[PDB]
Structures are given as structure tokens and as C-alpha cells.
Design a protein around this ligand. Structure first.
Ligand SMILES: [Cl-]
Ligand SMILES: [Cl-]
Ligand SMILES: [Mg+2]
Ligand SMILES: [Mg+2]
Ligand SMILES: [Mg+2]
Ligand SMILES: [Mg+2]
Ligand SMILES: [Mg+2]
Ligand code: NA
Ligand code: NA
Ligand code: NA
Ligand code: NA
Ligand code: NA
Length: 228
RNA sequence: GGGAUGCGUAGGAUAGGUGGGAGCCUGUGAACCCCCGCCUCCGGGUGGGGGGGAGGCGCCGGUGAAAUACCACCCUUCCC
């Protein structure tokens, strides 16, 4: 078989040709998470954009009302008085701009990296090759750069997520854990969808949310009506 | 509609993109072996069949721009 028996059993619980309401899907996804850990709940959208047109990029952040249900280890890079701000805001690690390389050596255990704009030259210059292709390079457009570094850090530790369309024109985000109560998943799903809509490019043609699905780390998908 | 296809270099070697991922598969038949189709960058890959009857796979590390399981939405090319 393509898939093992656990997966095949889950597949029987979803009607592949049905478009579910968000409320139904939020209940259903809880039964689609039988792998041996608390699985992540995901939302995917095929977007009505031309992904090869810079002016139709979809990229941003959204604070999920119920968070991600996971720890996010944040590294901050800062200079001057901003180091203390980063540290007092709860970053797991805060390095001065001048010690970047030592981060590279092996002190590199984090889920997210933030910086202030005035260290970004050092950051890019010395960290870009590594961080960039791992989705960890701070960028203003991704909400991971700014002088409000304390606020950024707090938002990330409170379950803000990033989203950015891939170059096929699809987009994806984690939005909670399968062990969440269903109405909390429902809230998080809608929050993400609202954020996507808030980021529909002005020049995008046709239906924006062409398809939207909810799914779990190791389970099948459920197609949803994003407007419910 | 049906079926395939995804390989610069380095790296086990055939790594399309992104997101999830620390677990996954297995008497609902593991390892290994044999037959056959298709695809092929000629390395292999992929799908089916027969034997077999209990072990494979991933996380880490290494290499690399990127990492292998598994799962999700997509995209490329080809065949009929
Ligand atoms: Cl934003
Ligand atoms: Cl300062
Ligand atoms: Mg589970
Ligand atoms: Mg892949
Ligand atoms: Mg692949
Ligand atoms: Mg992937
Ligand atoms: Mg591989
Ligand atoms: Na199973
Ligand atoms: Na199951
Ligand atoms: Na599952
Ligand atoms: Na995802
Ligand atoms: Na998935």
C-alpha cells in the first residue's frame, strides 16, 4: 500500500468530495490525528495569484487568538540599549551584533530569529546564507525586524505565525495542536483565513481562495468553505 | 479521465516547491531474493507479480543553498 493501515482508517473518516464548514472541520480534524504525538493542525490554500509576479506576493503575520500550542525559541540580535529590551521581553537568547559568528559556530538552537534594523547588515552579511534557506533570516516584510523588538518577541512567544506564498502559488501555516478543543481550532483557522484575505493583492484576478484545506501533521486533509 | 514524471555539483544517492514533522511502516506480511511493465539523467527510479516469514525507515551527524521517514497543498514534463 501507498499508506499504512492507520492512515487508511483516517481516510475513511473524510468525504474527499465534500466541502466542510470550518466548525465541522475543526471537530473532524481532531479524529484525524492518531499518530503517537500531539499533531500540528495546518491550513493550506491554493491562491488566485500569479506567484511569479512580485506585486502579487502574499506575505505577513497573524496573531492566532489561541496561539500555536508550542514553545517558540527566539534568538534576538541587537545593539546598545536594545539588548536589554530583547532580554527583558523574554527572548530565549539575545546576542550582541558583534558576537554573531559564535551563533554560527554551534550555539544555533532556535525556532525564530528577530533583529533591529541597525544590526541587519551584520546579520545578513554573516548569517544570511545559513538563516535564509531555513526561513530564519529576519526581514521587515516578515515582521521579524524592527526597533519594537520587545513587542515582536512578545508577539512571537504569544503564538504569532508567519505566512508567505510559495512560488507555485500555494500557502500554508500551522494553526494549533490537534489536542485543542474544536472551537479554539475553529477560531485559529478563521483568524488565519482573515489574515490571508487582508493580504489579497490588489491586482490578483478571480477568486482568491481557490481551495482551502485543513489537515494534521500525519493525517489526510479536509477541504473547507473558508467563508464559514 | 487514466498513468507516469521531478537526478547540476557535494552527499549513501535520482533532493521539483512550500508548509507540517519526531516519529513512521510491518502476520492487513519486515529484511532478502526472483519475474515483468513503464520511465530514465543509464545512476537507477517507479508500478505490478512470485517466493519469504520478521524486521526496515526517519529524527541526530555528515554533505549541501536545501535533508531525507511520514503527512499536506501545489507546480513541471511526458504518455494514452
Ligand atoms: Cl502582517
Ligand atoms: Cl542604543
Ligand atoms: Mg496524534
Ligand atoms: Mg520534498
Ligand atoms: Mg519529491
Ligand atoms: Mg517538504
Ligand atoms: Mg532523499
Ligand atoms: Na499504521
Ligand atoms: Na487511524
Ligand atoms: Na494522523
Ligand atoms: Na502545512
Ligand atoms: Na500534513
Amino acid at each position: 500500500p501507498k499508506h499504512g493501515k492507520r492512515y487508511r482508517a483516517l481516510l475513511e473518516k473524510v468525504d474527499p468530495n465534500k466541502i466542510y464548514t470550518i466548525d465541522e472541520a475543526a471537530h473532524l480534524v481532531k479524529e484525524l490525528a492518531t499518530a503517537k504525538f500531539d499533531e500540528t493542525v495546518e491550513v493550506h490554500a491554493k491562491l488566485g495569484i500569479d506567484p511569479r509576479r512580485s506585486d502579487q506576493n502574499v506575505r505577513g503575520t497573524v496573531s492566532l487568538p489561541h496561539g500555536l500550542g508550542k514553545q517558540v525559541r527566539v534568538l534576538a540580535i541587537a545593539k546598545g540599549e536594545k539588548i536589554k529590551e530583547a532580554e527583558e521581553a523574554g527572548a530565549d537568547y539575545v546576542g550582541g551584533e558583534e558576537i554573531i559568528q559564535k551563533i554560527l559556530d554551534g550555539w544555533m538552537d532556535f525556532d525564530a530569529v528577530v533583529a533591529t534594523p541597525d544590526v541587519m547588515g551584520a546579520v545578513g552579511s554573516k548569517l544570511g546564507r545559513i538563516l535564509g534557506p531555513r526561513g530564519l533570516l529576519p526581514n521587515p516584510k516578515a515582521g521579524t525586524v524592527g526597533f519594537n523588538i520587545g513587542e515582536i518577541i512578545r508577539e512571537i512567544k504569544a503564538g504569532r505565525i508567519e505566512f508567505r506564498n510559495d512560488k507555485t502559488g500555494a500557502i500554508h501555516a500551522p494553526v494549533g495542536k490537534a489536542s485543542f478543543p474544536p472551537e479554539k481550532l475553529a477560531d485559529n483557522i478563521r483568524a488565519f483565513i482573515r489574515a490571508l484575505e487582508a493580504h489579497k493583492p490588489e491586482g490578483a484576478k478571480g477568486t482568491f481562495l481557490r481551495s482551502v484545506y485543513v489537515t494534521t501533521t500525519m493525517g489526510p486533509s479536509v477541504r473547507i468553505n473558508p467563508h464559514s
